[PDB]
Amino acid sequence: TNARSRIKDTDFAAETAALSKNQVLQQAGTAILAQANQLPQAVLSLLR
Amino acid sequence: VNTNIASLNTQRNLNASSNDLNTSLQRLTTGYRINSAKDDAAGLQ
Amino acid sequence: VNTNIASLNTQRNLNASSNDLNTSLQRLTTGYRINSAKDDAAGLQ
DSSP: OHHHHHHHBOOHHHHHHHHHHHHHHHHHHHHHHHHHTTHHHHHHHHHO | OOSOOTTHHHHHHHHHHHHHHHHHHHHHHHSBSSOSSSSSHHHHO | OOSOOTTHHHHHHHHHHHHHHHHHHHHHHHSOSSOSSSSSHHHHO
8 A cells, every 4th residue: 555655646745836836837928928919019009 | 020929939838837737736636646547557557 | 645644554553452452351351361262272172
């Protein structure tokens, strides 16, 4: 049984950190996109 | 420039991120690092 | 960690303990160290 856990039993005290990292990335790349999609808007609004 | 947005590359990365995210949450629910799914089928077997 | 508790090993030891306990009490009741049970069948015989 102890083996069965060493196989399966996630050391989620580490995977929590991994988890935050993923949540974090979702957030960050999103905000980057909210910024990114403003670029072409500016380009044309000005050249016009 | 307007014809497209190279910054959709950002999007791609996030898709990967969200995939990882969901799988992690599965592992955190059941406590099984090897999902009942095939993934790492050796240890599963 | 949550998937299981290695400390159930403690439980196992206690099962053995309780077994010994009960047998001792039997021996203390009747005064017979060899239970009427088979145990140490040589002296019993």
